[PDB]
Amino acid sequence: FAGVGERTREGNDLYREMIESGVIKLGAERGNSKCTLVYGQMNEPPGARARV
Amino acid sequence: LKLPTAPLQLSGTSAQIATLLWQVAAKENQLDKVQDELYQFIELFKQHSELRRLATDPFVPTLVRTKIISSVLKDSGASEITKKLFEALADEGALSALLEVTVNYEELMLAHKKEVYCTVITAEPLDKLERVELTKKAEKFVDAGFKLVMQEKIDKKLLGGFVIEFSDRRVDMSTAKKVEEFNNFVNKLVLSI
Amino acid sequence: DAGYVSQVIGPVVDVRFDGELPSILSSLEVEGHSVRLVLEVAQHMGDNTVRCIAMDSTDGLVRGQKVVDTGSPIKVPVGRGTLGRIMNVIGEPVDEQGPIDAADIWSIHREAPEFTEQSTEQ
Amino acid sequence: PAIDAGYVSQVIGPVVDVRFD
Amino acid sequence: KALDELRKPKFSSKYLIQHVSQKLIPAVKEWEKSYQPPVIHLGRVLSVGDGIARVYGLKSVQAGELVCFDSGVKGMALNLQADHVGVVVFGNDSVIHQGDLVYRTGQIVNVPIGPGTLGRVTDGLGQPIDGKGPLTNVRSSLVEVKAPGIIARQSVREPLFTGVKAVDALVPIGRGQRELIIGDRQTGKTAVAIDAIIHQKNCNEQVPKAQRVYCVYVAVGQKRSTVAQLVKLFTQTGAMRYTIMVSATASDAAPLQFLAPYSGCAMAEYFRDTGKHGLIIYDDLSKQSVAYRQMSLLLRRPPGREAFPGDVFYLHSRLLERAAKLSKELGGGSLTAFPVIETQAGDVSAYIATNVISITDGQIFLETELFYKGIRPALNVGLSVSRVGSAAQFPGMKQVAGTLKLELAQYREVAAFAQFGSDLDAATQYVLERGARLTEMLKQKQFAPIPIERQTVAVYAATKGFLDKVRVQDIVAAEEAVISQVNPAVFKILKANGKITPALDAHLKAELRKVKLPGA
Amino acid sequence: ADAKALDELRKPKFSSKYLIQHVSQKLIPAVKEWEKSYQPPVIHLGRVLSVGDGIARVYGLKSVQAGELVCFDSGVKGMALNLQADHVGVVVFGNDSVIHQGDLVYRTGQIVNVPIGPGTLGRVTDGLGQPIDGKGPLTNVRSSLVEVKAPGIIARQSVREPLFTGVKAVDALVPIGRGQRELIIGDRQTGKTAVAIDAIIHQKNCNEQVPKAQRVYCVYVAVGQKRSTVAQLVKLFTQTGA
Ligand SMILES: Nc1ncnc2c1ncn2[C@@H]1O[C@H](COP(=O)(O)OP(=O)(O)OP(=O)(O)O)[C@@H](O)[C@H]1O
Ligand SMILES: Nc1ncnc2c1ncn2[C@@H]1O[C@H](COP(=O)(O)OP(=O)(O)OP(=O)(O)O)[C@@H](O)[C@H]1O
Ligand SMILES: [Mg+2]
Ligand SMILES: [Mg+2]
Predict the structure, then answer these.
(1) Residue ranges of E strands in B24-128
(2) Is residue E11 part of a domain?
C-alpha cells in the first residue's frame, strides 16, 4: 500500500483495520504479514509526497 | 565611512563599481594611476587568450580564477585598489565587466579633470586664424568653467563651415546644411505665394 | 567532495558542489540538520550547482551547511523485512517497531521494463 | 545643501525615482 | 575583433557592488583598523518595500528564522537567496531604511502557549492586545511543528457536540476531525462556529476536567470591530475562560495574517499534547491564503492558478494535519479543526476551496439561496458530507438520523414537482409535507445552542409525527412547546444513559401526548 | 556606456607599460600550474553547460544545424532545437540522468533520420526508428529526413479513389478518399482506436484482392499510450496477419 498524499487519519484507520483483521501481524509473528504500508500523507512537504 | 562625492552620477551595476573605484582612488589620490592600470588591463585582455578565457569561459572554476588573478597581480608595483578590485571581480566572474567599468571611470575622471571633449569636422585643413576664431564661438556652447578640447576631422561633403560634435549635442554651422535649409525655406513659399 | 547549500527557497534547495557534481535524481544528505533531511537532485543549475527538492521541511537550513553526496538515488530497505512495517519516503520505519530487516536495498528510481517483456494475457 | 537634496533618477509615468547621496 | 567577447557583461549576481564594496573600502590605507561591517551574524537592509526587506549578510541565518530589525520590528527570514536574504516584515515597513542593521535571533518563530493563554486576545505573533498585561502562565513553543504521525493517532470516537440542530443530526462532528464550513458572504459560517464555541460553555460545566473542550478562535483578515464585538459576546456569555482569541485583523501586516492560524494551532496544540480536548476555528482561511499570496508575490515567486503559489495546498495541509485524536500512549488528547472558506457566488471549483475541501473530512456547505428561504442555518443537506459518519454520532441521534437523511433525500427530489397545485399524488404529498416539517424543525436562532439531548427529543418528536398535526408555519414555536412541556426527567436521563433506551421510548412517546400544540 | 564610448578602447591607450610587460611572462606558468583543474576548450565541439527536465543547454557547438541530431558522450542522442547567442539548447532522447554538467556533446551532421523502406514493413520501432520488437537490426532499409517538405499544388491531383474502411457508418456517411486527411475526434473511451484498427484490418483484407498497385500499407503511430496497449495491438495485428 503506497498511500500517496491522503489524510493521516485514514492511514491510521487502515493500519488499525489491518492490525485487527490479521493482515499486519506485530511482534514475533511479523513474518506472516502480507502487506507493506508506505505512507506519504498530507503532512509532508511535496518532495516526499512526490516520491512515496 | 567618509567617501568623497563623485562629480557626475551614473547608471547601475557596472557604473556603480566605477563610482566606488573613483571614490576610493580619490580618497587615495591615485586617480590617474588606476586609469592607466585599467587601460593596461584592457590591452592585456586584448593581447593573450588565456586571460580572456578567464572571462568568457563558463567552465573555469572560481578557485583557479581567484588564485590566478591573485598570483599574477602579486607584483609589478600594482596599486592596492586595482589588486583588490580584480580580486573581487574575479571571485564573482565579473572580469568581463572591466570593459564597461573603465568607460564609466573615464567619464567620471573627465568630469573631474574638468575637461570636456568636442570634435569639429570640416572640409579643408584649418589654418591658425580659423582655429583661434573657432575656439571663441565653440566655447559659448559649454556651460561653466571647463577645458573644452577641440579635435579635428576632415570630410569633403561639407562645402565649408564647421560642425561641432560634443558627443551629446551637435552644432551644424556648416554651409552644406545652410544651403540645405535654404532650399527648404524657398519651396515652402513657392507652394504658398 | 562535499558541497554546501547555496540557496533555500521553499522546499527547493540549491546545493553548490565544487568539483564532481552528483547525477540527476541522486540522493543528498544534509549534515547538521536536526531531523534527518534528504535532498533529491532535480536538475543541474549550471555553475557547479544542483537544484534539489527536499523530502523534509527546510525550516532550519543555513547557507553553507555541508551536504554530502550518496552517489545514487533514494535507497529504501526492501524485501520480506518490510511486511507489516510502515515505511517512510526515504525508507525509514515510522511504525515505531524498530529498524527494518533488509533483504536488499534498492534505489527507488528505475526504468519502465521493455516492450518485449510484457504480458498480453487478459 | 549637497546632502539632503536628491535628484530625479528616472520617471515611468506617475512613478518617479529620486537618487540621493 | 578580439575585444567583442568581453563587450557585454555576464553577471552571475545582482548585488555585485555590495560584494565589491566589502573589498575595495579596505584598500584605503586609513581604513584597515576595524573599518568593516560584519555580516557573519548581522545583516544590512538592501531594499525595503511593500513589507518586504532584502537583507545582505546573515550568513548563519536559518530558513524561517525570526530576525529582528534595529528599528524594533521583527521579521521572518523566508527566502535565503544565494547573495541576500528575503526577509518579510511583521509590522509597518515605514520604520525601515536602506542601511539598517538586521540582528538575527537564532530562533524559529515562537508563540507563548500554556494555560495562561485562556482569555487572552493575542496576535498571530503572541502579543496580547486586550490590555490585561503580558502572558503570565505560559511557555514559548514553536509555530511550525511536525504533525503527528500514523502511530500517534487513534480512531475518532467521542463526539464534539455543536448545539446546532442542522449539523448535530446530519453532519456529525467527532472530537478530532477537521470540519470545513464553506459558504458565501453573510451565509452563517462564523455564526455556526460561534454556536460551536458557546455550546462548549454550556457543556463544560457538566463534564469532568478530562472531557472539557477549550476553544481557540483564529480571526484572520476580519475587522477589528468584528473581533471587538466577538470578545464582547464571549464575555457576555462568559465563554472567554475557555476561548483564546488569536486575531491578525485586516490592519495588521500580511505575514501576521499568514502566521495567525499557525500561531493559533500552536496555542491550541498545548491542550492536545496534555490530554485535554481542543477546538480550533481558523476563521476566514481564504484570507490567510490571500495574505500568503501577497507575501509570496512580493517575494518574486512564480505564481500559478489565480496567481497563488504552488505550495498553497501545502500551506493548508501542514496547518490542518495538526488536528487529530491522539492515542492513549500520547495522552488521548484531541484537536478539532474548523476551517472557514468563503466562496464567491458559489464557485466551489476555485483553487483554495477545492484544496481545503480535498483536505478536510467533513464539509458544511451553507448556501445563500436557502439562507433567504428562512432556513437559518443555511445548511445544504445534500452536499454536506461527514466522513466519520456514524462512528462518532451521538447514540439516540443515530436512531433517527438515518430516517432524517432518507426523508430529506426524498424531499430533495420531490422538488420541481410542487409548483403544480392541483397535481396531488397523496404519497409524494406526504413526503413533501414531511420534508417541510423536518426542514422547519432544524431552524435555530443564532447565539442559542441547544443541548444534544433536547435536540434528540425534538427531532424524535418530528420524525415520528408528533408534530405532524400542526401546519407548516407554526413549527418554530411548537418545537419550544415540545421542549418545555415534557418532563425535565427525560433530558436528565437521556444525557446520562447515552442512548434512547427501550425503558425510555415508551415514556416520552406518551409525554408527547400530554403536549399542547398551537394547531390542529 | 554606449557603443561609441566602447569602440574607442580597441585602440591602445595605456601610455605606460609597467603592468603588461611583467605579467605577460608570469601568466603562462600561472595557467600551467592549474592545468589539472581545467577542461579542454570546445569550439566545434559541445560541452553541457546545464541540464534539467530532459533539456540540456550545451555550450559550444559552433556548426550545428538547427534540428541536427547531436549525440552526447553518454550515448544518448539529442536534437538542437533552439540555437542561442552563446549556448545551444538541445533536447534529450531518453534518460536525462546520464547527462551531467560538464559532459561532451558531439554533433553528428545529420538532420534527424529514420530508416524507411520495404524492410521496416512489419516492425515495431520507437520514435527515432530503432526497432523495439527485437528481432535484429533493420535490413533492406535506408535513412531519410523526418521533416521533409510537403508536396505542393502541382504535385497533387484530385482525391477520387475511395478508401474503404470496413466500418459501415464510415463508408456510408463520411466516406474516406485515398488522399484525405480525416480526423477521428471524440472523448476518451469512445472507440477512436476502434475505427482506426478496423480500418487497418480492412486494408489488410483488401490488400489480398487488388493487383499490386492498389495495395495500401498502413502505418500506426502510438504516441503516449501504454507499452501494454502497444503490445496488445502487436498481438492483435499478428494474430490477424496485418
Ligand atoms: N440561526 C440564525 N438565525 C438567524 N439569523 C442568523 C442565524 N445564524 C446567522 N444569522 C445571521 O446571518 C449572518 C451571518 O453572518 P456571518 O457571521 O456568517 O458572516 P460571515 O459570512 O462569516 O462573513 P462576512 O461577514 O464576510 O459575510 C449574521 O448577521 C446573523 O445575524
Ligand atoms: N463498434 C464497437 N462495438 C463494440 N464495442 C466497441 C466498438 N468500438 C469500440 N468498442 C469497445 O469500446 C472500448 C473502447 O474502445 P477504444 O479503446 O477504441 O476507445 P478509445 O477512444 O481508444 O479510448 P482511449 O483513447 O482512452 O484508449 C473497447 O473495449 C472496445 O472493445
Ligand atoms: Mg464572518
Ligand atoms: Mg485510444
Answers:
(1) 119-122
(2) no
